[PDB]
Write a protein that binds this ligand. Structure first.
Ligand SMILES: [Cl-]
Ligand SMILES: [Cl-]
Ligand SMILES: [Cl-]
Ligand SMILES: [Cl-]
Ligand SMILES: [Cl-]
Ligand SMILES: [Cl-]
Ligand SMILES: [Cl-]
Ligand SMILES: [Cl-]
Ligand SMILES: [Cl-]
Ligand SMILES: [Cl-]
Ligand SMILES: [K+]
Ligand SMILES: [K+]
Ligand SMILES: [K+]
Ligand SMILES: [K+]
Ligand SMILES: [K+]
Lengths: 162, 165, 165, 162, 165, 165, 165, 165, 165, 165
């Protein structure tokens, strides 16, 4: 896996609380980042995983972690979904659009026969090193609280080596 | 260009009148087809071009011409756009989703830097042969009337070999 | 397609209003150009497409648009055709001869098994960027009016960055 | 990642409750399997991750899941460790030795510059399809209870499609 | 040179005495053939070399010799030239169009930077073997009389082995 | 074999008298070295061979000969084995761990199917040159006495060039 | 063919008027040259082609034209033939020996399965440019009178550029 | 090393007790073999190693072990050396000549810059599997007694599967 | 060298005793052959080597030995030389012409920068095996008497295998 | 053959008149050299060819000619043979050992399936140019007298250019 490797450079468009912005690897430097990948916008399962992360976001602006959700849809589509789904509307973190699939492939997380990303979460430290990885098949949800545990543990070790 | 070449096999999901269907090159054999590519769903420009084709769909269907719009968005996104936009809600033809980019690349129509299809229209005859191509840069609009005129000329020469418009 | 790519360097001989001249990509720099390809001179179909463009040349010249028709025939043949055909005689724009096929291959527009160019039109802006492409099979005519519309829209977008027609 | 792919064939030696046995891909066919990788035997952190999994093993023989722990040490070393560490002594599941690194590389989980496996866990269904993946850097422990959650969810979806 | 090699298969369209026909290597089998290449139709030099061969065509047909003139122009252009040049109008042998240049390249006779054939003449016997070759720069005419002489000498040798003429 | 070749650079962790150290080829330069490879720690055979070398370590050290045992096990495992086995507890020389297999492959001594090193001993002189090699199949024991005799002969010829034992 | 290309550098021995000399491309610079290839010396056919060229040598020299006959025989053999044959004895131009075949291959004129040159004549202008080529099979003689005509036409065109009738 | 690999096919000439014979891998099948390589015949060091092995040959023959000494010298040289050296005269086992170096390279035992074999001994079981390898630099003698010990241990393990000495 | 190898197949023309004949490897089968190469015919050095071989031809024929002299000249040239030179006129063995150099290259005997064969003699036995080779630079003559000696020794060994003194 | 090529660099050990020496191409510079190859030392045939050269060594040294015999045996073996064969004992010139076969391969004289050199003699002038080559099968002796003759003729030509001996 990509555990303990450095994230690669990227430049993508995103939707965040009503505005369109640019996100690059430079925006992660000096912060803790969570890259939350999912298959697609607008499907019919309510996105509890995205919503669950939203519930913990305040607590996530925190201990110092930025959250970037990612799918191969465009930022345009994320904006639409943010206005259509009451669950998605709760999202205050950046929703990255990855139509070329470069971000997804950077994290080796593309389902090539579908053009969609797999359900994978990555925790990246201020130096751009992936410290935790979680991937699940459709139907097996990711628990945000548990994500938080890992992140706290990740932070301790980093300030208390060993 | 791809003029006078045969379309390649494909298999995609599409949104057509409230449902999700599967389209393959098999559905196009024996029929006249229009592959109408566009960059993306939900952009802030009014999808005038797509609605314009909708306006002529009845006459196209009367002439045995199927229409397929294509974007690298998913069919899920097409369903939503169809239920959010007044213009897009007028569409009764299949709205193909091409998230792998395969269909778009079959027609050599990908803006590889952006992961979106260029604004191109292809007219395919019952034998799978491309008989008319139109591509334009962003901001330059496609006139459905011109497309319709071309289709009629194409169908005419097919019926009257060695005779031109 | 070649949409939004830069045209390539080329050097060809041409016939323009009684004279033989040389044309290169350098003559297109800073201007709007229309490259109008067609199969061959002297066939038996009235060359309505070329004459139709000639009818609009005056107006195109007002918009600062140059027109170059292109076939794999020589400039000598274009001169001869310009004196035998009353329709071709109307042409005041450059008729480029492309016997080596290099211009045609630059625009990836050659029918290799025939040694003739496909019926393709390309609109090129002052920076050498292709902004509109139109290709059709034999029998399916190109409407010059639709070409003008496209050129005007192209000029608008270029002078009003961040707008669509 | 390897999410939703089929595990590869393998043949390894292992230690399980006092006996040496052989494990092959054939031993996983028709069962749910958990492949628990770790860096090395005998280091000085008490292996709470391995012990935590042991605590849930009974409950793990279960709902029908076999547990295979894996490191690039030999089975001989696992036997020794099982007699030296009171925590390791609690282990009743198979301890696979992977000295050639083929199992570890099958799961693309080798730290090539060290010759040790990364801390990764994989959940494999009866048909050999990886349904859940978890990887963490040193210092960030894996919670066994949480592993169990994923496995149960994995099992539901598989018997209740969608 | 190609002396004593066998001509290669070819398929070209041609203009011959008012009609468009097809010519292939199969049409040369069992006959004496003259392949007469020239740069282009409609240039401003009198086509006297071609006219000179035309003057001798009667006599060549008596000797059982077929004549094929070849240029990289189309057969459509040969027809036009045949109606425009009083000299070309004398031509009753086949005027082959070679727009793809394959026939010209078969005889290794293409000026690649121009897309035109060099002024080369080849004499081919009933078995498809090249028995005489003549190539000249512009201005150095090819004499049909000398051509006839060579063909008669070639025909003699073929009916009287081990003797030179 | 690797006889008369120079050892390659390396960097490994080892267990030596209660502590963890790092060994590189730098530690061997200027000294006589014995690289004693074995398949694995904790097997049920009494590591008679390793203890046998321990028995001669004092005399080896007196002769300026360092010893390094090597296995693809980690140095953590060596520490444990050293504290579990009476025989292994007698060892005062470095016990190198080679989990990447790099050191073992430098000496072309890997059983690639098993990931364990073959039973081989290498004698390296102060210049890094291999002067004696011994390899045996499982069950065939290595005699430390023979190794000691060889080292003495090796040191002798180094001191008395052009003279043999 | 080699038409309109520059001759390549060469250095050969030759027999000329009772003497052995060296000939190189530098001896052709600034002059009109005729390279006359033939299969072999001493065959039993009267060497009428060489003698015919000999008859016109005086006159060619007046026009400033040098003649070099070439075969893959040595210059030694040319001397002998020049003393044995009454027809060859009239030759006053240089007889080049080409045993390595490098001159012959420069002119692409070797019958590889025989090691002999084909019956080819090349006319080279003062700048080393091949202006006329003639090749024939055995039995089909080369007419010196026709050669002379071509050379005069070549000289004319060169001094009166595009002054065609 | 070559430990636990199968020996390769070979065919060499040899001297054995007054006779010249041929030796191949087929002669080793079903027997225990010792391949004893050394640099060269006739050097000035007493060939103690070879004589030492000869002293143990009787006993080795009892254990069903064949001995083949090998150098890149010819069998002729071995015969000569066997008659000049009182030590070599003791040899009753086959002295293989390997002038082409193929046997030596089979055991990857050639000093390529010298054309001589390194001092290596290999013990091969009835199935052609190398069970012990010993290689030393010049000056470091091989002890035949240690060789015997190894062979006996090798025979034990082979007859008592799952044991170690 | 080619020593102890089999001659290769060849087919050449030759002059022999007033006649032109064909020679192939089949004409050498069952006989002893001498292939005598030399640079060229007609040089001004007295061809003493060929004449020396001629003097011994009778005697070589008694021993059942055929002689083939070879140069890259044609057989036509050999006939001429045989009629002009008193030394060459004594030659009754076959004079092979090798214009393509294939015979000469078969014997690896070509001076590539000259197109001539080196002064080499090869002795070939009834089975086509080269048994003696002699090559010399210009000025260093080949002695026919020494050749004869070698041929007799070759015949002896062939009929009395390893009967050496 | 290698006739008229320059010998290549080499470095070999040799036995010469009781001492071991080194020989390199540098030792041949400025001198006449004879490289005399033979298969092997100690065979059962009398070494008369070598003895014959030995008989002529005095005279060859007067002519400034050095003699190097060469076989793929070692110099150690040459020393032994020189003490064993009364014929070899007459040798006072250098006996080169070529165990790696590089000197033999330099002269393209190796029988690769045997690892022995063919019976070849080469005569090398002061500039390192091979002027005479002689190769024979077993049983066909090389005559030292004929060798001397060739060397004298070679020395003559070298001091009297443009004259053959
Ligand atoms: Cl990963
Ligand atoms: Cl296209
Ligand atoms: Cl295009
Ligand atoms: Cl993975
Ligand atoms: Cl040609
Ligand atoms: Cl080794
Ligand atoms: Cl040519
Ligand atoms: Cl080895
Ligand atoms: Cl040879
Ligand atoms: Cl040679
Ligand atoms: K997409
Ligand atoms: K053309
Ligand atoms: K290990
Ligand atoms: K040897
Ligand atoms: K020749």
């Amino acid at each position: 896996s990509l555990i303990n490797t450095k994230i690669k450079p990227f430049k993508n468009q995103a939707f965040k609380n009503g505005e369109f912005i640019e996100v690059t690897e430079k925006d992660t430097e000096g912060r803790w980042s969570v890259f939350f990948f999912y298959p697609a916008d607008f499907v019919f399962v309510c996105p509890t995983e995205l919503g669950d992360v939203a519930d913990h976001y305040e607590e996530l602006q925190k201990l110092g972690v930025d959250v970037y959700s990612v799918s191969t849809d465009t930022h345009f589509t994320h904006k639409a979904w943010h206005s259509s789904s009451e669950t998605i509307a709760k999202i205050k973190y950046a929703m990255i659009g990855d139509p070329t699939g470069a971000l997804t492939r950077n994290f080796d997380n593309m389902r090539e026969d579908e053009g969609l990303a797999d359900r994978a979460t990555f925790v990246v430290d201020p130096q751009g090193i992936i410290q935790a990885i979680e991937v699940t098949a459709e139907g097996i949800g990711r628990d945000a609280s548990d994500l938080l545990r890992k992140i706290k543990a990740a932070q301790y070790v980093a300030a208390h080596p060993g």
